[model samples]
Target: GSLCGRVFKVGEPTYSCRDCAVDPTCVLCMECFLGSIHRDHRYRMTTSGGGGFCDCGDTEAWKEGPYCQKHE
Candidate 1:
């Protein structure tokens, strides 16, 4: 019971990418990656979390012994 024409449940995300904290959108979007200050181009699949990826720190950047499990 609310507004909007269609239904919106705010489902989870199955795909995400690490992004810049300082203006992440502008820095992570295609425009930024095209040519600018950037590093690491990677995308990940579903997670228990609900929002998009944040390539800002070591949260999503999990570990696996001596390797970054998320990096390949």
Candidate 2:
């Protein structure tokens, strides 16, 4: 389960990690992006849609640390 228990709703801003994401579909909310280790990691920002969901704390989604401070 996602640590923040959040799903990236359609049109919401989402961040995708490039350096540590285990999959290309992995995405994170703005709060989780900025509050987590991925903030310093390479990432891409874009609108969330088409069933997008947060990957924070999902070990299967991230190769490195996933949980943000709030979620951890």
Worst 10 residues of 1 by lDDT: 1-10
Question: Candidate 2 — which residues are off by over 4 angstroms?
Answer: none
TM-score of 1: 0.19
Q: lDDT tens string, model 1, 1-72?
A: 111112112353332344423232211222222332333545443432333433322232322111122321
TM-scores for all candidates?
Answer: 0.19, 0.86
Report the C-alpha lDDT of model 2 over 1-72, residue by residue, as the tens digit. Answer: 347658667788989889998878888888888888888888899887647568887887888887887888
* lDDT score for candidate 1 against the true structure: 0.28
Number of clashes found in candidate 2 = 0
What is the Å distance of residue 6 in model 2 from its true position? 1.3
Candidate 2 weakest ten by summed lDDT: 1-10
